[PDB]
Design a protein around this ligand. Structure first.
Ligand SMILES: CC(C)(COP(=O)(O)OP(=O)(O)OC[C@H]1O[C@@H](n2cnc3c(N)ncnc32)[C@H](O)[C@@H]1OP(=O)(O)O)[C@@H](O)C(=O)NCCC(=O)NCCSC(=O)CCC(=O)O
Ligand SMILES: CC(C)(COP(=O)(O)OP(=O)(O)OC[C@H]1O[C@@H](n2cnc3c(N)ncnc32)[C@H](O)[C@@H]1OP(=O)(O)O)[C@@H](O)C(=O)NCCC(=O)NCCSC(=O)CCC(=O)O
Ligand SMILES: CC(C)(COP(=O)(O)OP(=O)(O)OC[C@H]1O[C@@H](n2cnc3c(N)ncnc32)[C@H](O)[C@@H]1OP(=O)(O)O)[C@@H](O)C(=O)NCCC(=O)NCCSC(=O)CCC(=O)O
Lengths: 278, 278, 278
């Protein structure tokens, strides 16, 4: 798809792009943005309006292109896996994310000293991906600890990411989900799927509708709909699971509907049983 | 109980209450609060003093009432389960919690643009419950990552909530505890109980005194005093536990004193044994 | 070692040290620091330059000494366990860490009210240890959620601490590691060791090179090089592990090289097998 937006970029004096903010997708309106242009000598950066036009099926070719792609995902214009992100790690700079805005990592010690004359300097994160909410708050969502949702996360209407939840870029919820565990990059969960506290979903992997991952559980395989993984139980691709009297590697149960995975507390054996009613 | 306090409320131009801060319980002193009244046109809110009087045994009837109840818990005037919270979710608004203060979720994009002229806008959370410490810091407590304690948490003197700890509203510690795992809404742990790193306590559930939940453990049943759950072991209500040669569903071991729960590493069987010395 | 640095201390009106910032180790240059000296009457603190000289092998004797030691670790001048920290907990004050800077816990309610006239007051943490990044950002590191790295953490070049990672003081990475779980105080992991999401390493304990702790795993013993602990599996010192037909308490497998620990999904038995290729 040809996608375009007008945004405001933060550039170092050597021309490295620390960030871009695109408030709206597909608009040429600049009036939100002209008051934000200028030069900050304490950070040694310039903020300047840019217009970015991309082919979402092509690999990104520069830092601006990479930033627009993350915005398209978090504004929910594009779902996870629908936009080409190949090579994005190479295009994003490591940035010090502060209460004063993004700062270059090279020379940060001098930067911090300059900024400290203006007020206390707090560093929220040092990374190539910022906190999503600092660029877009999608509608119909709650996020307890907004450090734990990267820009490029897709959070469908009706999602709650609790404080223990984490959602990486190119990942998230396609419908209404309670997310209290970790959704790795490239993982999606479909409508009504709830991820219990401290649960882990490995990234290849997606879960269908109305799944339940128990607290402290783990899922290393794709699941279909109406599956349950018992609290505390980690299903790896290599786990051998007893189903109807036979052992199956979990990788072969990928995409199954209506299975409850538990570890028998008497024998210690991993079992899967049908999820009755459904 | 009749409870009353004077506080300062933040109201949208449509009269929705985004927050109330009650610095003290039971006082009519306004002199801390009159300098904080006014109108913020970038957020489109008004801050105004309110006096709120409630019956803690009755269901809350409006947003102010709900906010006072959360304060009563976190100031430790009332313990968890001692105040009626029925319907509170319906009375609290979803709010964008920023470095500039609370902001309405509707229209936040315009709000963010207005505020960005004043300085970098950082969103800490988007939720119906704020961070406790932004309203009350109780005495004798440490909190590593104060994003992870909701207003309405009760943290007794001598509590440390480490960065991996999480304490929901209507929950917490009745005495001195090291909390490095998740205390769900309506869960309390009694004096000397330590919750290990990444442990999960389901919410009906409380733990007694001097309990130890191992790292990455889970507890889905009430426990009495001097119980231990091995690291990595999740006791669900349905788990069948071997105790003195017989199998018992864990729900039937609810409230037991002096049991150590472990998963036998040879057989894989969940067992409970007496906690000797005690 | 004799170690010395010039820094800027924040002192209460009773002379308690809330913090010290030492921008550089071993320098007498004050020109970064003289613009930061002064008195803040809303917090009731004074900021003043100090010169601190210590013997790293001796126990710290005052709060300034304790702060310099934490800096020496996070600037990577000293590795974990190389500096004497005995009694440090007694020398650090509990502090309220705010957007305005450190504040005393005694009297914070009055402090908060004073500061609220200047702007929204946000409390990041209440603890004896601050967030490392607010004092030093070491080179070659990423940190997703910088609430989760305490000052006194040592993060070697090439380390990424993801949002689920946590690194305590006197702890961390000796080389390039992806850290998505919890590195307790006094724990180190050597080059190429990756700590999976939600994994727990107990603190006596270190891991060698190229180890892999699966998501939601736990390690209660020292490991040598090229060990793997399966996702979801917690090895406690007391766990009895089957290796080559014999049962061994895990404490006796301390420091082993090239072992893969798994829980057999059929029998529920904890086993260790050689890590083939290596
Ligand atoms: C595996 C399930 C789904 C099974 O539950 P069900 O309700 O289907 O079964 P149930 O009625 O308990 O049990 C039916 C029968 O199976 C037995 N049974 C159950 N589990 C067993 C096991 N592992 N081994 C042997 N038997 C077992 C019961 O004793 C009962 O036996 P009889 O037939 O003999 O009676 C559950 O235990 C579970 O883990 N749910 C996880 C939910 C969760 O953690 N939600 C996430 C939000 S909670 C959260 O996030 C916590 C907060 C936080 O962590 O921060
Ligand atoms: C289950 C317990 C409590 C058992 O410990 P004890 O000290 O009572 O027993 P011990 O001396 O190790 O063992 C007594 C005997 O039982 C055997 N034994 C122990 N566990 C076994 C098992 N699971 N299967 C079979 N045998 C077992 C031992 O080998 C020994 O055998 P012989 O009799 O043959 O010798 C422990 O292993 C545990 O998990 N503690 C958890 C502590 C914890 O995680 N604390 C939280 C803070 S730590 C934390 O939070 C980490 C940081 C973070 O995560 O962020
Ligand atoms: C234990 C291992 C390492 C084993 O893996 P390997 O690749 O060596 O083996 P494999 O090819 O799967 O399996 C070899 C043979 O062993 C069998 N096998 C494997 N596990 C078994 C078990 N537990 N019980 C019985 N059999 C088992 C397989 O079925 C296969 O059988 P046949 O020979 O019959 O074929 C793995 O499953 C694991 O847990 N890796 C953890 C990785 C991880 O979590 N990384 C952290 C980043 S991921 C993360 O952090 C998630 C994000 C987040 O949490 O936030």
């Amino acid at each position: 798809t040809t996608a375009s937006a007008t945004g405001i970029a933060t550039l170092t004096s050597t021309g490295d792009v620390l960030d871009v903010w695109y408030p709206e997708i597909g608009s040429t309106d600049q009036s939100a943005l002209t008051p934000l242009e200028g030069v900050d000598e304490d950070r040694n950066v310039t903020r300047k309006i840019v217009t970015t036009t991309i082919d979402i099926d092509a690999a990104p070719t520069d830092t601006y292109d990479a930033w627009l792609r993350l915005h398209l995902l978090s504004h929910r214009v594009f779902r996870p896996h629908t936009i080409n992100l190949d090579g994005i790690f190479g295009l994003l700079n490591n940035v010090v994310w502060t209460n004063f805005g993004p700062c270059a990592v090279d020379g940060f010690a001098l930067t911090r000293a300059r900024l400290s004359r203006r007020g206390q300097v707090t560093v929220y994160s040092v990374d190539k991906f910022p906190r999503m909410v600092d660029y877009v708050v999608p509608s119909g969502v709650r996020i307890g600890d907004a450090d734990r949702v990267r820009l490029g996360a897709y959070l469908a209407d009706g999602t709650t990411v609790m404080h223990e939840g984490f959602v990486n870029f190119n990942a998230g919820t396609l419908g209404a989900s309670m997310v209290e565990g970790r959704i790795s990059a490239g993982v999606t969960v479909d409508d009504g799927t709830d991820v219990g506290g401290g649960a882990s979903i490995m990234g290849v992997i997606s879960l269908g509708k109305r799944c339940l991952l128990g607290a402290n559980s783990g899922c290393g395989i794709p699941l279909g709909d109406d599956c349950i993984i018992e609290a505390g139980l980690y299903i790896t691709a290599g786990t051998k699971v007893l189903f109807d009297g036979s052992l199956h590697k979990a990788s072969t149960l990928a995409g199954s509907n209506g299975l409850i995975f538990r570890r028998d507390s008497v024998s210690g054996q991993v079992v899967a049983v049908p999820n009755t009613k459904v």
